Amino acid sequence: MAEVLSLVDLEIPQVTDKYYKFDTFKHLICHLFKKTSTETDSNVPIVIIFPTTSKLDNLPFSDKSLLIQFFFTHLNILMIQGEGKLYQEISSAKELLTNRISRVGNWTGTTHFRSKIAGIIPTMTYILNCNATRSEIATNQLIYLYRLMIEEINFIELLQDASTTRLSQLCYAVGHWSFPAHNLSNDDLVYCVYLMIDYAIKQVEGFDNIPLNELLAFIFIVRDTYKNGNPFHNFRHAVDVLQACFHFLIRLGSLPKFKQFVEDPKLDYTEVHDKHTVLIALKASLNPIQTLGLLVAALGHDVGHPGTTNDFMIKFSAPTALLYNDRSVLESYHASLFINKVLRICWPDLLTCTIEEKSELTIRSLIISSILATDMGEHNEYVNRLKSFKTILNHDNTVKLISALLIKCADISNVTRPLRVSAQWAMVLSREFAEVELLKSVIKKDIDLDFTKDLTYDDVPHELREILEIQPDIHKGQIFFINLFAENLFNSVSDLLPQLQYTCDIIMENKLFWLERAK
Ligand SMILES: CC(C)Cn1c(=O)n(C)c(=O)c2nc[nH]c21
Ligand SMILES: [Mg+2]
Ligand SMILES: [Zn+2]
């Protein structure tokens, strides 16, 4: 029934599937951080058994509990410290967690018929509320626990392959416009984020450089807010959007080029490496701090995404849709979580920076603005505000608009990647859409699923041919989306920012191919 993690000799075989005994709280924590390295949602309840030199290991139970509750909320944990109430709680949680469609229903609050659910499973409203109402004292204690983990956990060791060869490969992967996101593990992707954010931080003048371990801790925490079982809106998508923004900013001159940068965006990915394990560097619209703010916003722009759409949340009266009055439902959620859960604890000093010495506009506000701009329901207004701007805004609102436009472009950049990679994204987006349709049918009682089994997928094919064979008609989704959203956005942005014209070039190349096989 449950995965049991113990710091003591007690056994609870009545509810135990697999039991892990840990010598230290630090090693238990490391086990938990690695759970988001996989491609699947954790689908079993986790019981942690506590007792009735390391600072982590010697924390009072109140602080150990606070750490687990806050940093590992996503893992469906029940904490005990030495039968009927336990068994029923775990049994109920297991019944609700096993199946993907059940999990999405739980998180979104749309399958009530089927606080934390069973005291264990978090919902979007629970997490949103917890982070909005947290006291100053609680906030400072979490900051202390975070710094404690940075002090005592060597995060590079939590990646499966941190060899010199692999790290160099990732530098070159980051350098390709044909970013091979689907060939990178969630561990690989963590290092990719480090490469890009570290590179950006180094360009910011009045701003200290942050050690490898501290950046990695932050990124592990970000990864932990994405749902690994989302076929599309997962940490891979976050890093991909970050990487697209990264390329945009390099090509606009907001960041310098680096030795591993691949100049020609139309090339497919080739696996390259050398002896370097970080990016080696060689007026712009956005200055160094705005550039960093944008990249950070891209990283966090879908945090906590439950694998649905605004339309689903609105039409099925999801609690978060009710909170947000149907207005930018998921994006409001992402912005609130990213700021109040992640950045407030992990990087509070970034939130209080301003976009320039003269400006009162904070990086917090810029991040919020940019994240909110990714709502496709507001797509037309950002396009019109761009066309009005091209034909006036003060500096602050100019920075907001440019940032908004770049993050919008990055968010839907899968259609501007070279065909093969673009097709892989199309396929996983189709998987997620199919899950949403299944969830709707479950809620409407148009289908009865076996909730004792989980949804599993074969790997995304490497080659375009196999993708087209697995689902022909991929073309019509791409044609629809390019005609109604992408073409107009990238053309308009490239008119303002000529360096991004290559995006329009690739879109057309892809469109012509999709139109070809429509015939
Ligand atoms: C977020 C989503 C509804 C928008 N959307 C879409 O509908 N299709 C078909 C795509 O290929 C796509 N790529 C990014 N966003 C996309
Ligand atoms: Mg989004
Ligand atoms: Zn997104």
Side-chain angles (χ1 to χ4, degrees):
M1 219 156 57
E3 171 168 309
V4 182
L5 312 182
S6 185
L7 294 167
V8 295
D9 298 315
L10 180 67
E11 287 179 49
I12 43 170
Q14 195 185 131
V15 301
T16 301
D17 179 21
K18 197 166 181 181
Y19 186 104
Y20 289 78
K21 176 71 201 305
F22 293 97
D23 60 340
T24 65
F25 188 46
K26 191 194 85 183
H27 283 148
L28 192 151
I29 288 170
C30 288
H31 177 78
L32 296 176
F33 276 124
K34 292 190 288 182
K35 289 188 168 283
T36 53
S37 72
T38 72
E39 294 300 322
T40 55
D41 296 317
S42 190
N43 73 336
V44 297
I46 295 171
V47 178
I48 301 178
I49 313 178
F50 289 89
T52 53
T53 179
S54 163
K55 302 193 184 198
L56 283 178
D57 297 346
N58 295 299
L59 288 170
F61 172 77
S62 67
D63 288 328
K64 286 204 179 77
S65 186
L66 178 54
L67 196 159
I68 294 305
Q69 271 189 42
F70 181 76
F71 297 100
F72 301 104
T73 181
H74 66 282
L75 292 181
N76 316 296
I77 293 162
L78 179 69
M79 295 182 278
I80 65 180
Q81 44 179 347
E83 299 194 344
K85 193 194 180 297
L86 176 67
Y87 184 91
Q88 196 271 345
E89 216 169 334
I90 292 172
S91 185
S92 289
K94 176 160 215 306
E95 282 165 15
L96 300 167
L97 283 166
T98 300
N99 175 279
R100 171 69 187 169
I101 305 303
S102 181
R103 290 195 292 281
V104 178
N106 295 332
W107 300 327
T108 58
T110 58
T111 54
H112 175 90
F113 69 92
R114 188 166 149 71
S115 191
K116 299 179 190 185
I117 297 163
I120 288 168
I121 304 171
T123 62
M124 292 169 71
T125 56
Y126 166 83
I127 294 154
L128 204 55
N129 181 254
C130 283
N131 287 280
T133 63
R134 191 183 53 242
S135 68
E136 187 194 45
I137 292 164
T139 292
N140 290 331
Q141 194 67 182
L142 291 172
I143 289 169
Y144 170 74
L145 294 167
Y146 172 64
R147 299 291 160 187
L148 231 52
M149 288 189 290
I150 288 161
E151 184 184 309
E152 307 189 350
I153 295 165
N154 196 14
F155 282 88
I156 196 80
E157 295 181 29
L158 300 182
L159 307 176
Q160 187 164 73
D161 186 352
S163 67
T164 299
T165 298
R166 191 48 169 164
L167 301 188
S168 180
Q169 283 174 344
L170 297 179
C171 297
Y172 281 97
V174 165
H176 281 82
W177 177 249
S178 200
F179 187 58
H182 308 284
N183 298 106
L184 305 175
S185 69
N186 283 321
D187 280 355
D188 286 330
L189 295 157
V190 164
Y191 195 77
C192 291
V193 177
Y194 157 71
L195 289 169
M196 293 179 276
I197 298 292
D198 189 37
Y199 196 73
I201 289 164
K202 284 172 177 171
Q203 315 314 132
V204 188
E205 203 78 73
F207 203 98
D208 290 311
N209 281 352
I210 296 169
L212 168 65
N213 201 48
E214 189 174 333
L215 273 185
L216 288 181
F218 163 61
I219 300 158
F220 269 78
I221 285 164
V222 172
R223 186 176 77 174
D224 286 348
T225 73
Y226 284 91
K227 304 305 199 184
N228 295 67
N230 291 3
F232 185 96
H233 292 100
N234 56 23
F235 181 63
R236 180 169 295 102
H237 172 67
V239 178
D240 187 56
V241 173
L242 170 58
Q243 194 267 2
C245 273
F246 193 68
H247 272 242
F248 295 165
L249 293 158
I250 289 156
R251 295 208 155 88
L252 295 162
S254 283
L255 297 155
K257 289 177 181 175
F258 49 103
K259 190 173 171 189
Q260 305 95 323
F261 186 79
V262 179
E263 187 61 54
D264 181 357
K266 301 187 185 195
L267 297 176
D268 206 345
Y269 174 65
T270 308
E271 185 173 271
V272 176
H273 77 268
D274 62 15
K275 70 184 160 61
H276 300 297
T277 61
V278 304
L279 305 192
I280 308 301
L282 303 175
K283 302 186 291 183
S285 299
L286 301 176
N287 76 4
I289 195 163
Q290 293 153 21
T291 293
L292 182 61
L294 208 203
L295 293 163
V296 173
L299 179 58
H301 85 281
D302 272 337
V303 296
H305 196 297
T308 61
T309 63
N310 283 338
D311 191 74
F312 168 85
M313 301 292 278
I314 293 158
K315 296 300 193 189
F316 288 80
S317 296
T320 53
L322 302 184
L323 277 181
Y324 286 124
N325 308 301
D326 300 347
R327 297 302 188 78
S328 297
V329 174
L330 291 177
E331 297 80 16
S332 299
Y333 178 78
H334 307 319
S336 192
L337 257 61
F338 186 49
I339 299 304
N340 301 308
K341 181 172 167 65
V342 179
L343 296 178
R344 183 64 189 83
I345 306 310
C346 297
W347 210 348
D349 289 351
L350 175 64
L351 294 176
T352 48
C353 292
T354 48
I355 62 158
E356 270 165 28
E357 289 175 25
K358 192 191 167 193
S359 191
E360 296 189 1
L361 182 68
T362 64
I363 295 298
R364 173 171 171 281
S365 296
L366 183 57
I367 289 168
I368 291 165
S369 173
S370 307
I371 292 177
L372 289 178
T374 63
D375 180 11
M376 288 298 291
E378 305 300 320
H379 174 100
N380 289 144
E381 200 186 350
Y382 287 99
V383 168
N384 296 348
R385 288 156 68 174
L386 169 55
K387 285 162 187 176
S388 300
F389 176 70
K390 204 207 170 192
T391 314
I392 52 179
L393 304 170
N394 67 18
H395 188 55
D396 291 357
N397 294 332
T398 306
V399 170
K400 278 179 163 169
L401 184 56
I402 293 161
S403 299
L405 295 165
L406 291 172
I407 200 175
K408 281 182 57 48
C409 285
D411 194 27
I412 66 162
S413 63
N414 57 81
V415 300
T416 68
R417 304 293 191 169
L419 182 59
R420 188 182 65 82
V421 169
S422 186
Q424 291 177 322
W425 282 114
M427 170 161 164
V428 301
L429 187 48
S430 298
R431 290 175 175 181
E432 195 168 299
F433 286 166
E435 289 182 1
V436 173
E437 292 298 311
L438 198 49
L439 177 52
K440 289 176 179 178
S441 304
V442 169
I443 294 166
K444 290 169 163 162
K445 300 166 160 54
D446 294 339
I447 195 171
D448 295 299
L449 293 187
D450 181 353
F451 292 107
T452 67
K453 302 185 196 314
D454 202 354
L455 279 57
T456 59
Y457 297 100
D458 291 343
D459 289 330
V460 175
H462 190 91
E463 296 297 342
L464 181 59
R465 288 187 197 175
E466 198 187 342
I467 295 171
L468 301 177
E469 191 157 14
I470 290 285
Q471 35 181 104
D473 87 23
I474 268 190
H475 64 266
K476 63 201 185 195
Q478 298 299 285
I479 293 157
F480 178 90
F481 183 72
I482 290 161
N483 282 338
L484 301 188
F485 297 107
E487 198 154 47
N488 180 42
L489 176 64
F490 284 96
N491 281 319
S492 191
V493 169
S494 53
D495 293 346
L496 184 74
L497 304 168
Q499 300 94 320
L500 312 184
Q501 175 62 36
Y502 75 93
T503 59
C504 306
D505 293 343
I506 296 168
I507 290 160
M508 186 54 70
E509 287 174 42
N510 291 338
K511 190 179 171 175
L512 291 176
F513 177 88
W514 296 124
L515 290 163
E516 184 210 328
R517 65 130 35 207
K519 305 155 193 164

